[PDB]
Design a protein around this ligand. Structure first.
Ligand code: EHR
Length: 136
């Protein structure tokens, strides 16, 4: 194979700033103890691409998670806060758009490259949290 535009996301990333993440977790429904422990985490995110399959790993003191997926194709995901969700990830003009559905609820996670950073925007019903990652 050759290069994919998605290769811009590939690499090892470390969290360097977080805003409104506690309120985002509140809106998602995360319980108190998990919110407090998850809110302290400074995860490393490892993104790789192999053919049509994109893999995103998150490693932290709170939880280690991994998803592998093909763009546009729905998959099952167990989130770090232990929700069992149906996820679909697409590419929209350079932005990975990740929709999670569960319990009749929905949240959208957008991952984008900005300068040398990987910016993650987590949105739930009017509440947005911004998570900024730098190369590890
Ligand atoms: O964490 C990020 O940047 C992130 C980036 C993209 C997607 C999801 C994300 N995190 C979470 C979302 C919901 C509930 C818990 C966590 C979490 C995961 C690991 C460690 C602490 C909280």
């Amino acid at each position: 194979r050759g290069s994919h535009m998605c290769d811009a996301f590939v690499g090892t990333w470390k969290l360097v700033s977080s805003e409104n993440f506690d309120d985002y977790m509140k809106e998602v429904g995360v319980g108190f103890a998990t919110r407090k422990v998850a809110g302290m985490a400074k995860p490393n995110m490892i993104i790789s691409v192999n053919g049509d399959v994109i893999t995103i790993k998150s490693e932290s003191t709170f939880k280690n998670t991994e998803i592998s997926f093909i763009l546009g194709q729905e998959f099952d995901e167990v989130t770090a806060d232990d929700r069992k969700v149906k996820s679909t990830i697409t590419l929209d003009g350079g932005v990975l758009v990740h929709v999670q559905k569960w319990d009749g609820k929905s949240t959208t996670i957008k991952r984008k490259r900005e300068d040398d950073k990987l910016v993650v925007e987590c949105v739930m019903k009017g509440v947005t949290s911004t998570r900024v990652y730098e190369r590890a």
